[PDB]
Amino acid sequence: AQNPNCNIMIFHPTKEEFNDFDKYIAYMESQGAHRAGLAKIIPPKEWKARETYDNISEILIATPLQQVASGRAGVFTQYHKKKKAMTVGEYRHLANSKKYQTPPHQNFEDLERKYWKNRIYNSPIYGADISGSLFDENTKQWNLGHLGTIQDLLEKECGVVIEGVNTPYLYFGMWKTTFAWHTEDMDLYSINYLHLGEPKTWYVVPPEHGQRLERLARELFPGSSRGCGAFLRHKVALISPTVLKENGIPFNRITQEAGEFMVTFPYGYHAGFNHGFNCAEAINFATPRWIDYGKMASQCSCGEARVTFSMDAFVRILQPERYDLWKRGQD
Numbered sequence: 001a002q003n004p005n006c007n008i009m010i011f012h013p014t015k016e017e018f019n020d021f022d023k024y025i026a027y028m029e030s031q032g033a034h035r036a037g038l039a040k041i042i043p044p045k046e047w048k049a050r051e052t053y054d055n056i057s058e059i060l061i062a063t064p065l066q067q068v069a070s071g072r073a074g075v076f077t078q079y080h081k082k083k084k085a086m087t088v089g090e091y092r093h094l095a096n097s098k099k100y101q102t103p104p105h106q107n108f109e110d111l112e113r114k115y116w117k118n119r120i121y122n123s124p125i126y127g128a129d130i131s132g133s134l135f136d137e138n139t140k141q142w143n144l145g146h147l148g149t150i151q152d153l154l155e156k157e158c159g160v161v162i163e164g165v166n167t168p169y170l171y172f173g174m175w176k177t178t179f180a181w182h183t184e185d186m187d188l189y190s191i192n193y194l195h196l197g198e199p200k201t202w203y204v205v206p207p208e209h210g211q212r213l214e215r216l217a218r219e220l221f222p223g224s225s226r227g228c229g230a231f232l233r234h235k236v237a238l239i240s241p242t243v244l245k246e247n248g249i250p251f252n253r254i255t256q257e258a259g260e261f262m263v264t265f266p267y268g269y270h271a272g273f274n275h276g277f278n279c280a281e282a283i284n285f286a287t288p289r290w291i292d293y294g295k296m297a298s299q300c301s302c303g304e305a306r307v308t309f310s311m312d313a314f315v316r317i318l319q320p321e322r323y324d325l326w327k328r329g330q331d
């Protein structure tokens with residue numbers, strides 16, 4: 001078995017290997033990358049997403065989210081308070097303000113220490129989940145707006161034509177902006193490209209150990225657990241690396257820098273934070289290997305997790321028994 005310790009692997013494809021996305025994902029899996037839940041892909045040196053980022057300031061962040069924490073430093077939840085719209089240029093100024101900027105630090109490790117120590121005492125503002133793309137239309141390789149769609153994958157594998165579309169999302173982050181512990185909708189893959197700015201630190205649990213994380217989460221968030229049998233789908237809970245180590249949960253960590261891709265694999269729980277002003281782009285995708293994960297994915301039916309139009313068909317076709325109850329949660 002390749003990569004039996006479930007380490008995060010880093011890949012350096014050549015320009016020739018960067019042509020065929022599906023084939024490279026399958027290569028990474030042949031080397032055991034999926035066992036970690038997360039892989040880094042450094043693009044060939046010849047590649048670029050677009051020519052410059054000089055003209056992005058007029059993108060609108062229609063609903064910036066203030067991430068308010070409750071709990072203790074290592075075990076907290078966050079809720080998202082909606083703020084007034086602002087442009088990317090306005091957001092970048094805010095991120096760089098004395099109130100919100102990255103503190104002085106020695107290195108990524110020092111910054112990670114400061115994040116875990118102090119995150120709960122601040123409420124950073126995240127421009128998340130903005131439909132759109134920063135890839136130039138002429139970028140032919142690993143262009144997240146030109147991937148094969150999950151609907152077409154399901155059709156190719158299973159023969160059923162379904163409604164739905166699949167488009168990317170932009171994330172504009174600042175210091176301490178945070179992504180809570182989650183897997184993807186329907187335990188899909190995700191791919192994330194850090195277009196610009198400061199890094200993003202990731203934590204991930206190997207898919208084979210996901211249920212260990214879930215069991216800890218039920219212990220640590222006991223009211224949430226009673227409210228919903230899949231409450232990590234709410235994307236609100238954080239658990240520090242110190243706490244994970246104290247409870248014997250297997251995980252790994254890595255920092256993504258501008259110009260790098262990360263891939264999350266089916267049922268790979270992940271969480272993380274941004275180091276400073278940045279912009280990432282991400283999208284879900286599927287492969288043949290995903291189908292069995294989609295069929296087994298947990299679902300939130302309590303009403304909190306509220307998701308896209310396109311998840312309907314996935315539940316309906318892969319999880320027909322669950323469909324009725326899950327749809328009640330959506331309506």
Ligand SMILES: O=C(O)CNC(=O)C(=O)O
Nearest residue numbers: 171179190191192280282
């Ligand atoms: O970058 C973020 O805030 C969150 N991204 C992801 O969870 C992902 O790409 O799967």
Ligand SMILES: [Mg+2]
Nearest residue numbers: 056057058059
């Ligand atoms: Mg603009």
Ligand code: NI
Nearest residue numbers: 183184190264
């Ligand atoms: Ni994710």
Ligand SMILES: [Zn+2]
Nearest residue numbers: 228300302304
């Ligand atoms: Zn729920």
